[PDB]
Structure formats: structure tokens, C-alpha cells
Design a protein around this ligand. Structure first.
Ligand SMILES: *C(=O)[C@@H](NC(=O)[C@H](N)c1ccccc1)[C@@H]1N[C@@H](C(=O)O)C(C)(C)S1
Ligand SMILES: *C(=O)[C@@H](NC(=O)[C@H](N)c1ccccc1)[C@@H]1N[C@@H](C(=O)O)C(C)(C)S1
Lengths: 244, 246
């Protein structure tokens, strides 16, 4: 069940952004959103994919453990912040595509397909190349599906060891206050064009007091300068709901 | 750890605030440690609330605490601090130092088991006399800054005699600051103000994961006035900043 909250629209109008935000208290039974249609519309996950990719890496033993260091070979990578040795959290935090690309090759198509089917992860379409299907391929997932997936990870109810789920959850912490903890992950596919814009994501959950909130945001983006709105619009919405 | 080295330069921030105390900082890759004062680094003090860390691990491991999603329900009967009068998750109890919560956990663990696990953890003098529900607050239990960093390293590496899953549960509960380049896990403690002649102690212990390095730390200081309590974070923090760690 998803309900439309009219007042959340103000935040998108301000910035002239087309997107959606989905927010759920306690569980994904009752969610609220600014747009019913766009909530269940599926988009390329881009780097929000790090999350199932990491779980599957651990599960398959491609990632040996919590403390493994992904060594840089010294060959050029597409961003300078990727040009260094990285732990798992480091790689998640800076969206180190090359690291996740090598994890995906090692997992292979067959296991990758099996796990996204196990995880009900979006359209579960991994075609287009094993090291790029989440970046430019045909894989697609909605804000609503993201919240369900993160809810299952929160409850240790994904098909993976509780241990591997805990390791990933800790790698995902992005903000810690006495009153609450935020785990979240960004994604950005690219600019595309004006006639066909890329998509930008922010997804995660907030543990506050004894309560938990799951969120997922995306928006059309045709200019990298618009990128901060992927955090600032949903932060505004949560700040105004007293969640952060 | 494998080695320790005195660096008296760190006495700077202590003198500046008229404070007697110690900071112990170790680099996990090199296994080597530095401190402003070797002597005080080895001296043993009441853990106070830093003891929440083994207490929570022992609670999980004996099954007294069910899991991280366990809620510790407030009965409603007034408690010693307003922030304790609310339901609390494990993290919640750790974060505000909810004494009565850990007292109940200790009571259900019991003396025999508590004794056992402090032996496994090599936790300080392992002395739990004084009542199973206050030995860490007003009893005979003492631990040093050095012992504290060794115990943390073990927790970090999942080497304590407890399940990896239970160690992970507590490790997450301990996160107190997050940033893209580093994660801090830590826990404070404060025994009380004691006296000008017999001061109390305040602690800040923890670890920082930055790039591919991990730094373990333990701070303690004498305290005879609550006005000085924020020093237990501001001094170690200035030192880790000057070392480029946070
Ligand atoms: C995940 O979303 C990654 N994005 C991509 O791989 C895109 N192909 C890309 C877009 C822009 C620049 C480089 C690659 C990472 N996400 C971006 C972000 O979160 O801002 C990134 C720049 C860190 S790469
Ligand atoms: C852990 O350190 C706890 N401290 C105590 O229970 C002391 N016995 C105490 C000292 C002074 C006043 C009241 C109790 C908790 N941590 C303290 C703190 O961090 O300030 C506390 C006072 C919140 S209780």
C-alpha cells in the first residue's frame, strides 16, 4: 500500500526537479510518496547496486571477508579517488566502479542471476555484459522495490548469512548521531540528454529511537551540477517530518 | 599490540587544560602504539561505562540479550537520568550509558558466567567483587588504557571468544561518527567526581577506520569537576587531528 502526500511536492517544484521520494515507517506495508506512478517506475540502479553486489560478493566468497583490501594495480581508473587501495566500506563510500566490476566478473552471470532472483531485485535483468549491466544495461528497479530490499537487509532476512548482512550494513553507515543512525547509498547513471535524462538516486534507512524509516529517492538529471539535490530534497523532507 | 613508545609532545593539550591523564594511540598495521605517558598508560582504573562493551557482548553471547533488534522497555518508574526514561535499543542503551539497563543484563548473566567471560577477554584485573550489578561502577574492577586498546583490537578483528555475529552486532552499536574517509567507533565512561584528593576518572576509548588503516585509542584523565568532562573528547580529538587521522 502506497499513499500520496501532496505536501512533499513543494520540494521538487522549488528546484524544478522531476522525481519521486518514497518513505516507510516500521515496514514497507504502508509507504508514503509524492507520486504514485513514479514510485513503482523502474530505473537503472547505478551505484545503488553496490549493495546487492557486495552481499553476493561476500556470499560467494569472492570477497573473502569483512577486512579484505581491494588492491589498486596502479593502472588508470576513471576517478582519482578510486586510484588507491580500498576496504569494502571505502569502495562502497566512493562508489569504486572498477572494484565492483571485478567482483561481478568473479561472481559470473549464473550466480549473479540466481542471487538477484533470490533478492527480488527489480526486473532481475542482468543482460548487457557482466561488468556493466547496472550501469548501462537493462537492469531496472523502482523506489518501492529499493525500500523493500533494504527492509529485508535491515531484518537480516535476505538469503545470505546474518554475518554477511551485518558486514554490509556497517559499510553503509553514512551518519551517526546520538539520537539516530543513517545508512544510505547514492547512485548516478550519467547525464544522458534533455530528451532522455540520466537518473540520480539516494536510498537507505534511518534508525531513530525505537523506530525505523526506509527511504528511496530518484530524479531525472541532465546536468551534474544538479547532483546535490539528490540528497538535499529528501533530507529536507525527512527534516520536516522530524526524522533527522 | 607489539610495541609502545612515549611521545611527551602530546602533553601539550594536557598542560593547556591543566589536566592529568593519558592517551594511547595504536596503528593496527604496524602493531605499534604511542602514548604521552608510559606510566599512566599502564595504571588501572574503574571502567565505568566503558564496560558496556564487554557487558553487551556477554549479554548477547549468553542470550540474555536476544539480538540487536531487542527493545529494552522502560517500566515507567523514575530513573537517575531523564534520558533513561524511554524504551531503548541496544545501541540506544549504549549511546546514553543507560546504567540500569546493563545492571539488569549483569544480574541475568550472573557472577559465574561474568567471571568466565572476563577471563576469556583478559579484561583488566578481572575483579568482579562488590556486587554483580555494580562492580564496574563502584567496585574492585580496574583496567588500563593499554588493556583497553588490546581488548578493542580483539573486538575489531572478531577475535574475542564470542560469535562473530555477536561482535558485529556490538561493533555497529558503537559507531559514533561517520564520514566518507573514516568511521569512528567509541564509548565514554565517567566514574563520578570523587574528590580533589581522590579524583574520579573519565574515559573515551574506541577506534577509527580510515582509508585502509585502523587506529585504536584509549583516553583517561582524573576529574574532580563535571565542567571538565568534555575534555575527555576534545583532547584526544585534537591529538588525532594533529596526526591527520580525523
Ligand atoms: C555509481 O553511481 C557510479 N556512477 C557511474 O558509474 C556513472 N557511470 C558515472 C557517472 C558520473 C561520473 C562517473 C561515472 C559512481 N557514482 C557517482 C556519484 O555517486 O556521484 C560517481 C561519480 C562517484 S561514479
Ligand atoms: C558511565 O560512565 C555512567 N556513569 C556513572 O554511572 C557514574 N557512577 C556517575 C558519575 C557521575 C554522575 C552520575 C553517575 C554513565 N555515564 C555518565 C556520563 O557519561 O556523564 C552518566 C552520569 C551519564 S551515567
Amino acid at each position: 500500500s502506497i499513499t500520496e502526500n501532496t505536501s512533499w511536492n513543494k520540494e521538487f517544484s522549488a528546484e524544478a526537479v522531476n522525481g519521486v521520494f518514497v518513505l516507510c515507517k516500521s515496514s514497507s506495508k504502508s509507504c508514503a510518496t509524492n507520486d504514485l506512478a513514479r514510485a513503482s517506475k523502474e530505473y537503472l540502479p547505478a551505484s545503488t547496486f553496490c549493495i546487492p553486489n557486495a552481499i553476493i560478493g561476500l556470499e560467494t566468497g569472492v570477497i573473502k571477508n569483512e577486512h579484505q583490501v581491494f588492491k589498486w594495480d596502479g593502472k588508470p581508473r576513471a576517478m582519482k579517488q578510486w586510484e588507491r587501495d580500498l576496504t569494502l566500506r571505502g569502495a562502497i563510500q566512493v562508489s569504486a566502479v572498477p572494484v565492483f566490476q571485478q567482483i561481478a566478473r568473479e561472481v559470473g552471470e549464473v550466480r549473479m542471476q540466481k542471487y538477484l532472483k533470490k533478492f527480488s531485485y527489480g526486473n532481475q535483468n542482468i543482460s548487457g555484459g557482466i561488468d556493466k549491466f547496472w550501469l548501462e544495461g537493462q537492469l531496472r528497479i523502482s523506489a518501492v522495490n529499493q525500500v523493500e530490499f533494504l527492509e529485508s537487509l535491515y531484518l537480516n532476512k535476505l538469503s545470505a548469512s546474518k554475518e554477511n548482512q551485518l558486514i554490509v550494513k556497517e559499510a553503509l553507515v553514512t551518519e551517526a548521531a546520538p539520537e539516530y543512525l543513517v545508512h544510505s547509498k547514492t547512485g548516478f547513471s550519467g547525464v544522458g540528454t534533455e530528451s532522455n535524462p540520466g537518473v540520480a538516486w539516494w536510498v537507505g534507512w534511518v534508525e531513530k529511537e525505537t523506530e525505523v524509516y526506509f527511504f528511496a529517492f530518484n530524479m531525472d538529471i541532465d546536468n551534474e551540477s544538479k547532483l546535490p539535490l539528490r540528497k538535499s530534497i529528501p533530507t529536507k523532507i525527512m527534516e520536516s517530518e522530524g526524522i533527522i
